[PDB]
Amino acid sequence: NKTVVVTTILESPYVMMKKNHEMLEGNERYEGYCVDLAAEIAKHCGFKYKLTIVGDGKYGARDADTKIWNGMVGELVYGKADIAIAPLTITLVREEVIDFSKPFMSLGISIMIKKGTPIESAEDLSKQTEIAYGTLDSGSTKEFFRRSKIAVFDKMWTYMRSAEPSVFVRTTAEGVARVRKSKGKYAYLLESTMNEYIEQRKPCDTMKVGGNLDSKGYGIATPKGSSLGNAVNLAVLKLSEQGLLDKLKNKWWYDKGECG
Amino acid sequence: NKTVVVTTILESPYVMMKKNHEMLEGNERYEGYCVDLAAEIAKHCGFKYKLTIVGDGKYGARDADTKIWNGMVGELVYGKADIAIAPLTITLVREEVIDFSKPFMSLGISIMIKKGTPIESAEDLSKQTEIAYGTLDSGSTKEFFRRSKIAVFDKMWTYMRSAEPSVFVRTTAEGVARVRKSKGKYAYLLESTMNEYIEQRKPCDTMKVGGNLDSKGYGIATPKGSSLGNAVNLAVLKLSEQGLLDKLKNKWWYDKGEC
Ligand SMILES: CN(C)C(=O)c1ccc(-n2nc(C(F)(F)F)c3c2CCCC3)cc1
Ligand SMILES: N[C@@H](CCC(=O)O)C(=O)O
Ligand SMILES: N[C@@H](CCC(=O)O)C(=O)O
Ligand SMILES: [Zn+2]
Ligand SMILES: [Zn+2]
Numbered sequence: 001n002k003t004v005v006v007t008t009i010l011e012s013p014y015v016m017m018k019k020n021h022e023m024l025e026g027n028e029r030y031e032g033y034c035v036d037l038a039a040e041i042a043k044h045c046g047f048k049y050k051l052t053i054v055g056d057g058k059y060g061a062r063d064a065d066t067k068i069w070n071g072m073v074g075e076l077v078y079g080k081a082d083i084a085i086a087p088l089t090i091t092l093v094r095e096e097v098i099d100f101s102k103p104f105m106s107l108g109i110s111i112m113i114k115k116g117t118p119i120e121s122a123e124d125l126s127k128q129t130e131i132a133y134g135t136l137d138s139g140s141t142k143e144f145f146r147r148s149k150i151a152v153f154d155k156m157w158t159y160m161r162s163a164e165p166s167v168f169v170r171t172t173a174e175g176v177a178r179v180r181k182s183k184g185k186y187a188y189l190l191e192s193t194m195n196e197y198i199e200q201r202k203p204c205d206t207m208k209v210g211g212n213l214d215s216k217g218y219g220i221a222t223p224k225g226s227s228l229g230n231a232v233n234l235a236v237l238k239l240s241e242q243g244l245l246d247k248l249k250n251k252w253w254y255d256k257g258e259c260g
Numbered sequence: 261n262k263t264v265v266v267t268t269i270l271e272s273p274y275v276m277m278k279k280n281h282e283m284l285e286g287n288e289r290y291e292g293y294c295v296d297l298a299a300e301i302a303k304h305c306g307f308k309y310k311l312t313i314v315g316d317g318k319y320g321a322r323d324a325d326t327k328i329w330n331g332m333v334g335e336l337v338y339g340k341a342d343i344a345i346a347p348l349t350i351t352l353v354r355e356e357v358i359d360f361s362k363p364f365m366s367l368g369i370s371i372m373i374k375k376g377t378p379i380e381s382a383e384d385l386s387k388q389t390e391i392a393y394g395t396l397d398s399g400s401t402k403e404f405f406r407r408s409k410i411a412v413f414d415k416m417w418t419y420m421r422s423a424e425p426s427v428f429v430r431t432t433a434e435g436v437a438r439v440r441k442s443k444g445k446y447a448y449l450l451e452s453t454m455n456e457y458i459e460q461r462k463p464c465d466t467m468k469v470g471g472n473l474d475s476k477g478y479g480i481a482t483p484k485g486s487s488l489g490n491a492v493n494l495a496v497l498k499l500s501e502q503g504l505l506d507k508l509k510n511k512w513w514y515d516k517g518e519c
Binding site for chain 2 (some may be wrong): 091092103106150216217219237238240241246
Protein backbone atom coordinates (compact mmCIF):
# COMPACT_ATOMS: atom_id res chain seq x y z
CA ASN A 1 0.00 0.00 0.00
CA LYS A 2 1.66 3.18 -1.30
CA THR A 3 0.21 6.68 -1.78
CA VAL A 4 -0.35 7.24 -5.51
CA VAL A 5 1.31 10.39 -6.87
CA VAL A 6 -1.18 12.05 -9.25
CA THR A 7 0.12 14.61 -11.74
CA THR A 8 -2.35 17.20 -12.92
CA ILE A 9 -2.46 20.74 -14.27
CA LEU A 10 -4.09 24.01 -13.19
CA GLU A 11 -6.68 24.37 -15.94
CA SER A 12 -10.23 25.57 -15.33
CA PRO A 13 -12.59 23.96 -14.52
CA TYR A 14 -10.57 20.75 -14.22
CA VAL A 15 -8.27 21.75 -11.36
CA MET A 16 -8.45 25.11 -9.65
CA MET A 17 -7.21 26.49 -6.36
CA LYS A 18 -10.10 26.97 -3.92
CA LYS A 19 -10.72 30.60 -2.92
CA ASN A 20 -9.48 29.79 0.60
CA HIS A 21 -6.59 27.56 -0.52
CA GLU A 22 -3.92 29.27 1.61
CA MET A 23 -5.55 27.95 4.81
CA LEU A 24 -5.97 24.42 3.43
CA GLU A 25 -3.55 21.52 3.05
CA GLY A 26 -2.72 18.81 0.52
CA ASN A 27 -5.56 17.67 -1.74
CA GLU A 28 -8.02 19.95 0.00
CA ARG A 29 -6.39 23.00 -1.65
CA TYR A 30 -7.96 22.13 -5.01
CA GLU A 31 -11.36 21.78 -6.63
CA GLY A 32 -12.76 20.99 -10.04
CA TYR A 33 -13.84 18.25 -12.41
CA CYS A 34 -10.54 16.34 -12.25
CA VAL A 35 -10.39 16.75 -8.47
CA ASP A 36 -13.82 15.12 -8.23
CA LEU A 37 -12.83 12.51 -10.82
CA ALA A 38 -9.58 11.66 -8.97
CA ALA A 39 -11.57 11.10 -5.78
CA GLU A 40 -13.99 8.75 -7.56
CA ILE A 41 -11.24 6.82 -9.36
CA ALA A 42 -9.32 6.36 -6.11
CA LYS A 43 -12.42 5.14 -4.26
CA HIS A 44 -13.26 2.58 -6.94
CA CYS A 45 -9.64 1.42 -7.29
CA GLY A 46 -8.97 1.44 -3.54
CA PHE A 47 -5.94 3.72 -3.36
CA LYS A 48 -4.83 6.77 -1.40
CA TYR A 49 -3.35 9.61 -3.45
CA LYS A 50 -1.58 12.97 -3.48
CA LEU A 51 -2.46 15.57 -6.10
CA THR A 52 0.58 17.36 -7.47
CA ILE A 53 0.66 20.17 -10.03
CA VAL A 54 2.95 19.37 -12.95
CA GLY A 55 6.28 21.16 -12.45
CA ASP A 56 6.61 22.75 -15.87
CA GLY A 57 2.89 23.56 -16.31
CA LYS A 58 2.67 21.63 -19.60
CA TYR A 59 0.56 18.82 -21.02
CA GLY A 60 3.42 17.01 -22.77
CA ALA A 61 5.39 17.02 -25.99
CA ARG A 62 8.64 15.38 -27.11
CA ASP A 63 11.62 17.60 -27.99
CA ALA A 64 12.54 16.85 -31.63
CA ASP A 65 16.26 17.02 -30.85
CA THR A 66 16.80 15.44 -27.42
CA LYS A 67 13.68 13.21 -27.63
CA ILE A 68 12.88 14.15 -24.00
CA TRP A 69 9.22 14.39 -22.97
CA ASN A 70 8.04 17.35 -20.94
CA GLY A 71 4.80 18.05 -19.07
CA MET A 72 2.56 15.49 -17.43
CA VAL A 73 3.58 12.95 -20.07
CA GLY A 74 7.24 13.39 -19.07
CA GLU A 75 6.33 13.01 -15.39
CA LEU A 76 4.88 9.58 -16.16
CA VAL A 77 7.63 8.54 -18.58
CA TYR A 78 10.47 9.35 -16.13
CA GLY A 79 8.73 7.94 -13.04
CA LYS A 80 7.98 11.20 -11.22
CA ALA A 81 4.23 10.48 -11.03
CA ASP A 82 2.10 7.33 -10.94
CA ILE A 83 -0.97 8.57 -12.85
CA ALA A 84 -2.16 11.70 -14.67
CA ILE A 85 -5.72 12.84 -14.07
CA ALA A 86 -6.19 15.86 -16.27
CA PRO A 87 -7.69 17.03 -19.57
CA LEU A 88 -4.94 15.08 -21.34
CA THR A 89 -5.71 14.26 -24.96
CA ILE A 90 -5.32 10.67 -26.16
CA THR A 91 -2.89 10.83 -29.12
CA LEU A 92 -0.91 8.32 -31.13
CA VAL A 93 2.51 9.73 -30.17
CA ARG A 94 1.58 9.61 -26.49
CA GLU A 95 -0.03 6.14 -26.63
CA GLU A 96 3.35 4.91 -27.85
CA VAL A 97 5.04 5.87 -24.50
CA ILE A 98 2.26 5.89 -21.88
CA ASP A 99 -1.05 4.08 -21.39
CA PHE A 100 -4.46 5.76 -21.53
CA SER A 101 -7.77 4.61 -20.08
CA LYS A 102 -10.87 4.65 -22.24
CA PRO A 103 -11.86 8.31 -22.64
CA PHE A 104 -13.80 10.07 -19.87
CA MET A 105 -14.69 13.11 -22.00
CA SER A 106 -15.14 13.92 -25.64
CA LEU A 107 -13.80 17.08 -27.30
CA GLY A 108 -12.62 18.64 -30.54
CA ILE A 109 -10.41 21.56 -31.50
CA SER A 110 -12.51 24.73 -31.78
CA ILE A 111 -12.28 28.47 -32.39
CA MET A 112 -12.65 31.11 -29.68
CA ILE A 113 -13.39 34.70 -30.74
CA LYS A 114 -14.11 37.95 -28.98
CA LYS A 115 -17.82 38.59 -29.57
CA GLY A 116 -18.46 40.37 -32.87
CA THR A 117 -15.31 39.15 -34.63
CA PRO A 118 -16.25 38.51 -38.28
CA ILE A 119 -15.03 34.90 -38.36
CA GLU A 120 -17.37 31.90 -38.65
CA SER A 121 -15.00 29.01 -39.47
CA ALA A 122 -11.40 27.78 -39.82
CA GLU A 123 -11.77 28.48 -43.56
CA ASP A 124 -12.53 32.13 -42.64
CA LEU A 125 -9.38 32.44 -40.54
CA SER A 126 -7.19 30.88 -43.23
CA LYS A 127 -8.37 33.32 -45.93
CA GLN A 128 -7.32 36.54 -44.11
CA THR A 129 -4.45 38.23 -42.22
CA GLU A 130 -6.14 41.04 -40.20
CA ILE A 131 -7.06 38.66 -37.38
CA ALA A 132 -4.14 36.73 -35.89
CA TYR A 133 -4.73 33.23 -34.51
CA GLY A 134 -2.74 30.60 -32.62
CA THR A 135 -2.68 27.71 -30.17
CA LEU A 136 -1.21 26.44 -26.89
CA ASP A 137 2.42 25.29 -26.84
CA SER A 138 3.39 21.68 -25.92
CA GLY A 139 -0.08 20.30 -26.48
CA SER A 140 -2.14 18.25 -28.88
CA THR A 141 -3.73 21.22 -30.71
CA LYS A 142 -0.38 22.55 -31.93
CA GLU A 143 0.60 19.04 -33.06
CA PHE A 144 -2.72 18.79 -34.92
CA PHE A 145 -1.86 21.80 -37.07
CA ARG A 146 1.78 20.78 -37.44
CA ARG A 147 0.68 17.44 -38.90
CA SER A 148 -2.54 18.19 -40.81
CA LYS A 149 -2.62 17.59 -44.56
CA ILE A 150 -6.12 19.08 -44.83
CA ALA A 151 -5.77 22.16 -47.06
CA VAL A 152 -7.26 24.77 -44.73
CA PHE A 153 -5.41 23.51 -41.64
CA ASP A 154 -2.13 23.23 -43.55
CA LYS A 155 -2.50 26.84 -44.70
CA MET A 156 -3.23 27.82 -41.09
CA TRP A 157 -0.08 26.11 -39.78
CA THR A 158 2.07 27.70 -42.50
CA TYR A 159 0.78 31.02 -41.20
CA MET A 160 1.09 30.24 -37.46
CA ARG A 161 4.59 28.73 -37.48
CA SER A 162 6.12 31.84 -39.11
CA ALA A 163 3.85 34.58 -37.70
CA GLU A 164 5.60 37.53 -36.03
CA PRO A 165 4.95 38.36 -33.20
CA SER A 166 4.38 34.80 -31.98
CA VAL A 167 0.78 33.60 -32.02
CA PHE A 168 1.42 30.74 -29.56
CA VAL A 169 0.75 30.88 -25.82
CA ARG A 170 2.15 29.12 -22.70
CA THR A 171 -1.20 28.52 -20.97
CA THR A 172 -4.86 28.43 -21.96
CA ALA A 173 -5.43 31.39 -19.61
CA GLU A 174 -2.88 33.38 -21.65
CA GLY A 175 -4.69 32.55 -24.91
CA VAL A 176 -8.06 33.57 -23.44
CA ALA A 177 -6.66 36.83 -22.08
CA ARG A 178 -5.11 37.57 -25.49
CA VAL A 179 -8.52 37.18 -27.16
CA ARG A 180 -10.24 39.40 -24.56
CA LYS A 181 -7.71 42.21 -24.85
CA SER A 182 -7.09 42.22 -28.63
CA LYS A 183 -10.28 44.03 -29.78
CA GLY A 184 -11.25 41.22 -32.20
CA LYS A 185 -7.78 40.93 -33.73
CA TYR A 186 -6.79 37.59 -32.15
CA ALA A 187 -8.69 34.29 -32.31
CA TYR A 188 -7.63 31.31 -30.20
CA LEU A 189 -7.68 27.63 -31.22
CA LEU A 190 -8.41 25.44 -28.22
CA GLU A 191 -10.39 22.42 -27.15
CA SER A 192 -14.20 22.71 -27.22
CA THR A 193 -14.43 21.75 -23.53
CA MET A 194 -12.32 24.71 -22.41
CA ASN A 195 -13.96 26.99 -24.98
CA GLU A 196 -17.48 26.12 -23.82
CA TYR A 197 -16.52 26.67 -20.19
CA ILE A 198 -15.03 30.14 -20.82
CA GLU A 199 -18.07 31.10 -22.91
CA GLN A 200 -20.13 30.73 -19.69
CA ARG A 201 -17.88 32.83 -17.45
CA LYS A 202 -17.82 36.58 -16.84
CA PRO A 203 -17.12 38.93 -18.51
CA CYS A 204 -19.10 36.89 -21.09
CA ASP A 205 -17.20 38.43 -24.02
CA THR A 206 -16.04 35.35 -25.90
CA MET A 207 -17.74 32.69 -27.94
CA LYS A 208 -17.18 29.43 -29.70
CA VAL A 209 -17.74 29.68 -33.46
CA GLY A 210 -18.14 27.01 -36.11
CA GLY A 211 -17.98 23.27 -35.71
CA ASN A 212 -15.17 21.33 -34.10
CA LEU A 213 -12.15 20.65 -36.32
CA ASP A 214 -11.69 17.10 -35.03
CA SER A 215 -13.16 14.61 -32.58
CA LYS A 216 -11.21 12.92 -29.82
CA GLY A 217 -11.06 12.20 -26.11
CA TYR A 218 -9.26 12.81 -22.81
CA GLY A 219 -8.00 9.77 -20.94
CA ILE A 220 -6.43 8.96 -17.58
CA ALA A 221 -2.77 8.16 -18.21
CA THR A 222 -0.39 5.73 -16.45
CA PRO A 223 3.22 4.72 -17.17
CA LYS A 224 3.55 1.88 -19.69
CA GLY A 225 2.55 -1.41 -18.08
CA SER A 226 1.59 0.14 -14.70
CA SER A 227 -0.24 -2.08 -12.16
CA LEU A 228 -2.96 0.61 -11.93
CA GLY A 229 -3.92 0.76 -15.62
CA ASN A 230 -6.45 -2.08 -15.65
CA ALA A 231 -8.36 -0.96 -12.58
CA VAL A 232 -8.41 2.69 -13.70
CA ASN A 233 -9.81 1.72 -17.08
CA LEU A 234 -12.65 -0.29 -15.54
CA ALA A 235 -13.35 2.52 -13.09
CA VAL A 236 -13.70 5.02 -15.92
CA LEU A 237 -16.23 2.76 -17.65
CA LYS A 238 -18.13 2.24 -14.39
CA LEU A 239 -18.32 6.01 -13.77
CA SER A 240 -19.46 6.58 -17.33
CA GLU A 241 -22.20 3.94 -17.02
CA GLN A 242 -23.38 5.23 -13.63
CA GLY A 243 -23.85 8.72 -15.13
CA LEU A 244 -21.21 10.23 -12.83
CA LEU A 245 -19.18 11.76 -15.67
CA ASP A 246 -22.33 13.50 -16.94
CA LYS A 247 -23.09 14.72 -13.41
CA LEU A 248 -19.58 16.17 -13.10
CA LYS A 249 -19.73 17.90 -16.45
CA ASN A 250 -23.04 19.56 -15.49
CA LYS A 251 -21.64 20.52 -12.09
CA TRP A 252 -18.55 22.27 -13.44
CA TRP A 253 -19.71 23.73 -16.75
CA TYR A 254 -23.34 24.72 -16.61
CA ASP A 255 -24.35 24.75 -12.94
CA LYS A 256 -21.48 27.25 -12.50
CA GLY A 257 -22.48 29.29 -15.57
CA GLU A 258 -22.54 33.05 -14.99
CA CYS A 259 -23.64 34.37 -18.36
CA GLY A 260 -27.29 33.48 -17.66
CA ASN B 261 1.01 -15.97 -40.79
CA LYS B 262 -2.72 -16.62 -40.56
CA THR B 263 -5.88 -15.11 -42.06
CA VAL B 264 -7.70 -13.11 -39.38
CA VAL B 265 -11.37 -14.04 -38.97
CA VAL B 266 -13.37 -10.83 -38.56
CA THR B 267 -16.80 -11.04 -36.99
CA THR B 268 -19.26 -8.30 -37.99
CA ILE B 269 -22.99 -7.71 -38.28
CA LEU B 270 -25.38 -6.75 -41.08
CA GLU B 271 -26.31 -3.29 -39.81
CA SER B 272 -26.68 -0.34 -42.16
CA PRO B 273 -24.55 1.51 -43.14
CA TYR B 274 -21.79 -0.36 -41.33
CA VAL B 275 -22.02 -3.62 -43.29
CA MET B 276 -24.46 -4.25 -46.14
CA MET B 277 -24.73 -6.76 -48.94
CA LYS B 278 -23.66 -5.31 -52.30
CA LYS B 279 -26.47 -5.36 -54.89
CA ASN B 280 -24.43 -7.81 -56.98
CA HIS B 281 -23.06 -9.87 -54.06
CA GLU B 282 -24.10 -13.25 -55.51
CA MET B 283 -21.60 -12.73 -58.35
CA LEU B 284 -18.79 -11.62 -56.02
CA GLU B 285 -16.65 -13.59 -53.57
CA GLY B 286 -15.26 -13.32 -50.07
CA ASN B 287 -14.85 -9.82 -48.66
CA GLU B 288 -16.00 -8.31 -51.94
CA ARG B 289 -19.62 -9.30 -51.19
CA TYR B 290 -19.99 -6.55 -48.61
CA GLU B 291 -19.85 -2.80 -48.42
CA GLY B 292 -20.14 -0.05 -45.81
CA TYR B 293 -18.35 1.94 -43.13
CA CYS B 294 -17.05 -1.10 -41.25
CA VAL B 295 -16.05 -2.80 -44.52
CA ASP B 296 -13.94 0.27 -45.37
CA LEU B 297 -12.58 0.43 -41.83
CA ALA B 298 -11.67 -3.30 -41.77
CA ALA B 299 -9.65 -2.93 -44.95
CA GLU B 300 -7.76 0.00 -43.44
CA ILE B 301 -7.14 -1.64 -40.06
CA ALA B 302 -5.85 -4.75 -41.86
CA LYS B 303 -3.53 -2.67 -44.12
CA HIS B 304 -2.08 -0.74 -41.20
CA CYS B 305 -1.62 -3.79 -38.97
CA GLY B 306 -0.31 -5.97 -41.82
CA PHE B 307 -2.74 -8.89 -41.82
CA LYS B 308 -4.96 -10.75 -44.27
CA TYR B 309 -8.56 -11.15 -43.13
CA LYS B 310 -11.90 -12.73 -43.82
CA LEU B 311 -15.18 -10.97 -43.05
CA THR B 312 -17.84 -13.20 -41.54
CA ILE B 313 -21.34 -12.25 -40.44
CA VAL B 314 -22.17 -13.24 -36.86
CA GLY B 315 -24.29 -16.40 -36.94
CA ASP B 316 -27.00 -15.37 -34.50
CA GLY B 317 -27.26 -11.78 -35.78
CA LYS B 318 -26.61 -10.34 -32.30
CA TYR B 319 -24.22 -7.85 -30.72
CA GLY B 320 -23.46 -9.71 -27.50
CA ALA B 321 -25.02 -10.34 -24.11
CA ARG B 322 -24.43 -12.90 -21.37
CA ASP B 323 -27.38 -15.17 -20.53
CA ALA B 324 -28.28 -14.71 -16.84
CA ASP B 325 -28.93 -18.46 -16.43
CA THR B 326 -26.41 -20.28 -18.68
CA LYS B 327 -23.82 -17.46 -18.40
CA ILE B 328 -23.04 -18.05 -22.09
CA TRP B 329 -22.19 -15.03 -24.26
CA ASN B 330 -24.02 -14.69 -27.57
CA GLY B 331 -23.50 -12.45 -30.60
CA MET B 332 -20.16 -11.03 -31.75
CA VAL B 333 -18.88 -10.96 -28.16
CA GLY B 334 -19.53 -14.72 -27.96
CA GLU B 335 -17.64 -15.31 -31.20
CA LEU B 336 -14.59 -13.63 -29.62
CA VAL B 337 -15.01 -15.23 -26.16
CA TYR B 338 -15.28 -18.78 -27.53
CA GLY B 339 -12.53 -18.45 -30.14
CA LYS B 340 -14.64 -18.47 -33.31
CA ALA B 341 -13.39 -15.05 -34.49
CA ASP B 342 -10.13 -13.14 -34.01
CA ILE B 343 -11.50 -9.59 -34.10
CA ALA B 344 -14.84 -7.78 -34.25
CA ILE B 345 -15.12 -4.73 -36.51
CA ALA B 346 -18.66 -3.48 -36.02
CA PRO B 347 -20.80 -0.86 -34.27
CA LEU B 348 -20.01 -2.66 -31.00
CA THR B 349 -20.45 -0.51 -27.91
CA ILE B 350 -17.69 -0.38 -25.32
CA THR B 351 -19.30 -1.40 -22.01
CA LEU B 352 -17.94 -2.42 -18.64
CA VAL B 353 -19.41 -5.95 -18.70
CA ARG B 354 -17.87 -6.59 -22.11
CA GLU B 355 -14.47 -5.03 -21.24
CA GLU B 356 -14.27 -7.58 -18.44
CA VAL B 357 -14.23 -10.48 -21.01
CA ILE B 358 -12.86 -8.95 -24.25
CA ASP B 359 -10.51 -6.12 -25.17
CA PHE B 360 -11.60 -2.94 -26.95
CA SER B 361 -9.48 -0.48 -28.90
CA LYS B 362 -9.81 3.21 -28.23
CA PRO B 363 -13.16 4.23 -29.75
CA PHE B 364 -13.51 4.92 -33.46
CA MET B 365 -16.93 6.58 -33.23
CA SER B 366 -18.87 8.49 -30.58
CA LEU B 367 -22.59 7.89 -29.99
CA GLY B 368 -25.32 8.02 -27.39
CA ILE B 369 -28.74 6.51 -26.92
CA SER B 370 -31.34 8.62 -28.70
CA ILE B 371 -35.06 8.75 -29.56
CA MET B 372 -36.42 8.06 -33.06
CA ILE B 373 -39.96 9.25 -33.78
CA LYS B 374 -42.23 9.20 -36.82
CA LYS B 375 -42.36 12.84 -37.92
CA GLY B 376 -45.07 14.71 -36.06
CA THR B 377 -45.04 12.53 -32.93
CA PRO B 378 -45.63 14.88 -29.94
CA ILE B 379 -42.47 13.79 -28.09
CA GLU B 380 -39.36 15.94 -27.51
CA SER B 381 -37.46 14.08 -24.77
CA ALA B 382 -37.04 10.95 -22.69
CA GLU B 383 -38.84 12.84 -19.91
CA ASP B 384 -41.78 13.22 -22.36
CA LEU B 385 -41.89 9.50 -23.12
CA SER B 386 -41.72 8.58 -19.44
CA LYS B 387 -44.71 10.74 -18.45
CA GLN B 388 -47.21 9.40 -20.99
CA THR B 389 -48.83 6.14 -22.09
CA GLU B 390 -50.32 6.66 -25.59
CA ILE B 391 -47.00 6.23 -27.45
CA ALA B 392 -45.23 2.92 -26.82
CA TYR B 393 -41.44 2.72 -26.92
CA GLY B 394 -38.71 0.10 -26.82
CA THR B 395 -35.17 -0.94 -27.70
CA LEU B 396 -33.19 -3.63 -29.52
CA ASP B 397 -33.97 -6.73 -27.45
CA SER B 398 -30.32 -7.66 -27.07
CA GLY B 399 -27.63 -5.00 -26.82
CA SER B 400 -26.12 -2.21 -24.84
CA THR B 401 -29.22 0.03 -25.10
CA LYS B 402 -31.43 -2.51 -23.33
CA GLU B 403 -28.77 -3.01 -20.65
CA PHE B 404 -28.54 0.79 -20.15
CA PHE B 405 -32.22 0.93 -19.16
CA ARG B 406 -32.07 -2.30 -17.16
CA ARG B 407 -29.21 -0.88 -15.03
CA SER B 408 -30.08 2.81 -14.79
CA LYS B 409 -30.56 4.44 -11.38
CA ILE B 410 -31.66 7.73 -12.98
CA ALA B 411 -35.37 8.28 -12.19
CA VAL B 412 -36.55 9.06 -15.74
CA PHE B 413 -34.75 6.03 -17.19
CA ASP B 414 -35.84 3.75 -14.33
CA LYS B 415 -39.44 4.79 -15.04
CA MET B 416 -38.91 3.97 -18.71
CA TRP B 417 -37.43 0.56 -17.94
CA THR B 418 -40.24 -0.27 -15.51
CA TYR B 419 -42.64 0.41 -18.38
CA MET B 420 -40.68 -1.34 -21.12
CA ARG B 421 -39.90 -4.56 -19.26
CA SER B 422 -43.62 -5.11 -18.59
CA ALA B 423 -45.22 -3.76 -21.77
CA GLU B 424 -47.40 -6.20 -23.69
CA PRO B 425 -47.08 -6.98 -26.50
CA SER B 426 -43.27 -6.73 -26.33
CA VAL B 427 -41.80 -3.35 -27.16
CA PHE B 428 -38.43 -4.90 -27.93
CA VAL B 429 -37.24 -5.76 -31.43
CA ARG B 430 -34.80 -8.32 -32.91
CA THR B 431 -33.01 -5.93 -35.29
CA THR B 432 -32.62 -2.20 -35.79
CA ALA B 433 -34.45 -2.64 -39.11
CA GLU B 434 -37.44 -4.10 -37.23
CA GLY B 435 -37.50 -1.11 -34.84
CA VAL B 436 -37.36 1.36 -37.72
CA ALA B 437 -40.18 -0.44 -39.55
CA ARG B 438 -42.23 -0.41 -36.36
CA VAL B 439 -41.84 3.39 -36.01
CA ARG B 440 -42.76 3.86 -39.66
CA LYS B 441 -45.90 1.71 -39.55
CA SER B 442 -47.24 2.74 -36.13
CA LYS B 443 -48.71 6.19 -37.09
CA GLY B 444 -46.78 7.96 -34.33
CA LYS B 445 -47.71 5.47 -31.61
CA TYR B 446 -44.28 3.78 -31.34
CA ALA B 447 -40.94 5.51 -30.67
CA TYR B 448 -37.64 3.66 -30.91
CA LEU B 449 -34.65 4.03 -28.58
CA LEU B 450 -31.45 3.43 -30.53
CA GLU B 451 -27.94 4.74 -30.92
CA SER B 452 -27.59 8.24 -32.36
CA THR B 453 -25.39 6.94 -35.18
CA MET B 454 -28.09 4.59 -36.48
CA ASN B 455 -30.79 7.23 -35.82
CA GLU B 456 -28.89 9.91 -37.78
CA TYR B 457 -28.37 7.48 -40.67
CA ILE B 458 -32.05 6.50 -41.00
CA GLU B 459 -32.99 10.20 -40.78
CA GLN B 460 -31.17 10.61 -44.14
CA ARG B 461 -32.92 7.68 -45.84
CA LYS B 462 -36.09 7.56 -47.91
CA PRO B 463 -38.95 7.87 -47.15
CA CYS B 464 -37.59 10.60 -44.81
CA ASP B 465 -40.41 10.03 -42.30
CA THR B 466 -38.36 9.66 -39.11
CA MET B 467 -36.26 11.99 -37.02
CA LYS B 468 -34.03 12.10 -34.01
CA VAL B 469 -35.50 14.15 -31.16
CA GLY B 470 -34.00 15.60 -28.00
CA GLY B 471 -30.48 15.24 -26.67
CA ASN B 472 -28.71 11.91 -26.30
CA LEU B 473 -29.36 9.98 -23.07
CA ASP B 474 -25.74 8.93 -22.63
CA SER B 475 -22.32 9.29 -24.23
CA LYS B 476 -20.01 6.49 -25.22
CA GLY B 477 -18.16 4.87 -28.11
CA TYR B 478 -17.77 1.90 -30.43
CA GLY B 479 -14.49 0.02 -30.30
CA ILE B 480 -12.75 -2.71 -32.27
CA ALA B 481 -12.79 -5.80 -30.09
CA THR B 482 -10.32 -8.66 -29.68
CA PRO B 483 -10.22 -11.69 -27.39
CA LYS B 484 -8.65 -10.93 -24.03
CA GLY B 485 -4.87 -10.75 -24.34
CA SER B 486 -4.81 -11.15 -28.16
CA SER B 487 -1.56 -10.25 -29.96
CA LEU B 488 -3.50 -8.00 -32.36
CA GLY B 489 -4.85 -5.57 -29.76
CA ASN B 490 -1.90 -3.18 -29.51
CA ALA B 491 -1.50 -2.71 -33.26
CA VAL B 492 -5.25 -2.33 -33.79
CA ASN B 493 -5.35 0.38 -31.14
CA LEU B 494 -2.50 2.33 -32.71
CA ALA B 495 -4.16 1.98 -36.12
CA VAL B 496 -7.44 3.43 -34.79
CA LEU B 497 -5.58 6.42 -33.39
CA LYS B 498 -3.63 6.95 -36.60
CA LEU B 499 -6.80 6.78 -38.68
CA SER B 500 -8.56 9.18 -36.31
CA GLU B 501 -5.68 11.68 -36.44
CA GLN B 502 -5.40 11.50 -40.24
CA GLY B 503 -9.10 12.38 -40.66
CA LEU B 504 -10.11 9.01 -42.14
CA LEU B 505 -12.82 8.26 -39.60
CA ASP B 506 -14.46 11.63 -40.35
CA LYS B 507 -14.25 10.97 -44.09
CA LEU B 508 -15.85 7.53 -43.70
CA LYS B 509 -18.70 8.93 -41.60
CA ASN B 510 -19.42 11.59 -44.20
CA LYS B 511 -19.23 8.99 -46.98
CA TRP B 512 -21.76 6.58 -45.50
CA TRP B 513 -24.15 8.94 -43.68
CA TYR B 514 -24.30 12.24 -45.52
CA ASP B 515 -22.64 12.17 -48.96
CA LYS B 516 -25.29 9.74 -50.23
CA GLY B 517 -28.14 10.98 -47.97
CA GLU B 518 -31.52 10.74 -49.75
CA CYS B 519 -33.40 13.49 -47.89
C1 LIG C 1 -17.16 9.45 -21.91
N1 LIG C 1 -17.47 9.68 -23.33
C2 LIG C 1 -17.84 11.04 -23.63
C3 LIG C 1 -16.89 8.82 -24.17
O1 LIG C 1 -16.89 7.62 -23.95
C4 LIG C 1 -16.11 8.90 -25.43
C5 LIG C 1 -16.31 8.11 -26.60
C6 LIG C 1 -15.47 8.33 -27.67
C7 LIG C 1 -14.47 9.30 -27.50
N2 LIG C 1 -13.55 9.53 -28.58
N3 LIG C 1 -12.15 9.31 -28.23
C8 LIG C 1 -11.30 9.15 -29.27
C9 LIG C 1 -9.82 8.96 -29.03
F1 LIG C 1 -9.52 7.83 -28.44
F2 LIG C 1 -9.12 9.20 -30.09
F3 LIG C 1 -9.39 9.98 -28.31
C10 LIG C 1 -11.98 9.21 -30.40
C11 LIG C 1 -13.45 9.30 -29.99
C12 LIG C 1 -14.52 9.54 -31.15
C13 LIG C 1 -13.97 9.92 -32.52
C14 LIG C 1 -12.75 9.06 -32.88
C15 LIG C 1 -11.58 9.08 -31.88
C16 LIG C 1 -14.26 10.07 -26.38
C17 LIG C 1 -15.09 9.87 -25.30
N1 LIG D 1 -5.58 18.67 -23.90
C1 LIG D 1 -4.37 19.15 -24.64
C2 LIG D 1 -3.92 20.54 -24.19
C3 LIG D 1 -4.79 21.68 -24.71
C4 LIG D 1 -4.57 21.98 -26.19
O1 LIG D 1 -3.53 21.56 -26.77
O2 LIG D 1 -5.45 22.65 -26.79
C5 LIG D 1 -3.23 18.15 -24.49
O3 LIG D 1 -3.43 17.10 -23.88
O4 LIG D 1 -2.16 18.41 -25.03
N1 LIG E 1 -24.22 -1.02 -30.42
C1 LIG E 1 -25.11 -1.83 -29.54
C2 LIG E 1 -26.27 -2.44 -30.31
C3 LIG E 1 -27.37 -1.45 -30.64
C4 LIG E 1 -28.18 -1.01 -29.43
O1 LIG E 1 -28.14 -1.68 -28.36
O2 LIG E 1 -28.90 0.02 -29.55
C5 LIG E 1 -24.30 -2.93 -28.88
O3 LIG E 1 -23.09 -3.06 -29.08
O4 LIG E 1 -24.89 -3.72 -28.14
ZN1 LIG F 1 -18.45 6.20 -7.45
ZN1 LIG G 1 15.09 21.29 -27.81
